């Protein structure tokens, strides 16, 4: 609901301050992005994002992110790209990784 704010007191958590209706509005669940922004009367109207698009934090952005295209060959996905997470590629099955990177490392090695 469009909770009317009062100067000297901030909005509660899970509520942002729209600067078009000048009134506090709610923040909806991760994995769904605001299709129609908050207005004086209407609250946030947010719709789930499409495939390979996620949002891990309570958002109001009009567009989600994008996961990786593919893990190519000999790389099993260790975490599927659902609505609240990424596509973390990793090493080959039956091997391990000795290097490191942001998500999937740069040098594998046999399981010894």
């Amino acid at each position, epitope marked *: 609901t469009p909770y009317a704010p009062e100067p000297g007191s901030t909005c509660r958590l899970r509520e942002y301050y729209d600067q078009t209706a000048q009134m506090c509005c709610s923040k909806c669940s991760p994995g769904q992005h605001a299709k129609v922004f908050c207005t004086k009367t209407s609250d946030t109207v947010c719709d789930s994002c499409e495939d390979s698009t996620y949002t891990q934090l309570w958002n109001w952005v009009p567009e989600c992110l994008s996961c990786g295209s593919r893990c190519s060959s*000999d790389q099993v996905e260790t975490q599927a790209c659902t609505r609240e997470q990424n596509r973390i590629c990793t090493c080959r099955p039956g091997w391990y990784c000795a*290097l490191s990177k942001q998500e999937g490392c*740069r040098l594998c090695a046999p399981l010894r």
Partner: antibody
Amino acid sequence: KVQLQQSGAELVKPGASVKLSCKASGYTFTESIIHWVKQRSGQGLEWIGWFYPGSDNINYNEKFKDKATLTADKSSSTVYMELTRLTSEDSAVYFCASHEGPYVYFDYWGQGTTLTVSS
Amino acid sequence: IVMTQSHKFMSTSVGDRVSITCKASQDVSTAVAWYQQKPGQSPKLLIYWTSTRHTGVPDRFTGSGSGTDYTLTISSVQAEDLALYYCQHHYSTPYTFGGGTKLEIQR
């Protein structure tokens, strides 16, 4: 797209130290691993350890443990290979190469330098 | 670990098929890469994973084999197949290549 560039050519004497420079261009440097290989006259290629600069992971081949020293400064995206005790057997082409996937297949082959050792 | 080829001087012609071999020293499973090394220039990448054709190289450079015996082949050998092909593995810390099996065309 990734390019690796070395120097033109050098010449040293038995008991010297020339520094081979490999400059990467096209991608970042915090994420660009570098391997060094030596092609002698006629025989097959060899391999030397890697110098992942972002995590500063340094690995060396057993044979070339005490000949090559790897160091880099993250100000020009270059990797320097310092050679020691250069006998007459080190007169060979030197390549610096890197891979793309996490397996290590050399797809980015830098131009080879033509180091020769003589008095 | 050491990776060694068998013959050094495959001799062939236009239209024949070459069978450059490569035999590891251990059970190297399915890890090998093939390089073409036209003298003067720098090595190129032909094959990896013993059967995966790298982007760009022609379809005739098909890899084959499995386990410990690997075999490049060219079924339509043209003039520009004159180089020193090498094979490599991806397991130990000391990566090792072999000798240079040099093709040579007769006319």
